């Protein structure tokens, strides 16, 4: 199912699937469709999303096996408030460590831009404001620049992902063995 909250075969993840998910959110000024393909060799178990800005009405997909991708979404808080969708998703991996993913889709593009990041944290660590600060300010996040970026994560893993630049945002990440 190309529906937020679903887990799909990981080879099925791509821009078309995420655009469907994004569109299905409707007319909201700032929104995101997130897809993350687990090709890490270990099962992932959802912990939480820390929403610095915005909300989601989707259950964070609980179990994501190797060879599956998760689909997710978020959107700005409702009403005229001039805020975006910003947060960190945290999954526990079966080795006892944490996969964290930052997204930032800001309201005001005169000052801010789209960013994303991926990091592995040692141990089981829920997403929170400190994790957000680290990933957004200190751990060299990638711009949502309509381009692909790759980086090693340690722990025998690497990441490759893409985010666009606008307020109707797609974030596609693949986690693979190094
Ligand atoms: C990410 N940020 C909070 C530093 C700026 C953009 O967030 P927002 O105020 O538009 O929600
Ligand atoms: C994300 N960053 C803090 C590394 C660079 C600043 O980007 P922004 O908050 O001005 O968009």
Question: Structurally, what CATH architecture does the domain formed by 1-178 represent?
Answer: Sandwich (2.60)
Residue 136 marked as a ligand binder: yes
Distances in Å between the Cα of 86 and the Cα atoms of 16, 31, 106 are 23, 10, 7
Instruction: Choose among 48, 12, 19, 16: nearest CA to 33.
Output: 19
Domain coordinates of the chain in residue numbers?
A: 1-178
Any idea which ligand is nearest the CA of 103? Answer: 1
Q: What three-state secondary structure class fits 6?
A: coil
104 close to 142: Cβ distance less than 8 angstroms: no
- Per the entry, the structure determination technique was X-ray
What resolution in Å is listed for this PDB structure?
1.6
Q: Is the CB of 136 under 6 A from ligand 2?
A: yes
Can you name the residues that pair with 101 across neighbouring β-strands?
89, 118
Residue 130 is inside which H or E element, if any?
A: helix 129-133
Distance (Å) from CA 86 to ligand 1 centroid: 7
What six digits make up the tokens of 97?
């460590």
What is the atom index within ligand 2 of the atom nearest the CA of 115? Answer: 1
Q: Are 76 and 31 in contact (CB under 8 A)?
A: yes
């Amino acid at each position: 199912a190309d529906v937020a909250g679903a887990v799909i075969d990981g080879a099925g993840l791509g821009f078309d699937v995420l655009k469907t998910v994004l569109e299905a959110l409707g007319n909201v000024k700032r929104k995101i469709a997130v897809g993350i393909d687990n090709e890490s060799g270990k099962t992932w178990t959802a912990m939480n999303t820390y929403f610095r800005s915005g909300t989601s009405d989707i259950v964070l997909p609980h179990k994501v096996a190797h060879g599956k991708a998760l689909l997710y979404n978020g959107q700005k808080n409702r009403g005229p408030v001039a805020t975006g969708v910003v947060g960190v998703i945290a999954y526990s991996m079966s080795d006892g460590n944490t996969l964290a993913v930052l997204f930032s889709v800001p309201y005001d593009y005169n000052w801010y831009s789209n960013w994303w990041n991926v990091r592995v944290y040692k141990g089981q660590k829920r997403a929170d404001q400190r994790m957000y600060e680290e990933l957004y300010y200190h751990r060299s996040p990638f711009r949502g620049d309509n381009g692909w970026h790759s980086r090693g994560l340690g722990y025998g893993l690497k990441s490759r992902g893409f985010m666009n630049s606008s307020g109707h945002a797609i974030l596609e990440i693949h986690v693979t063995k190094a």
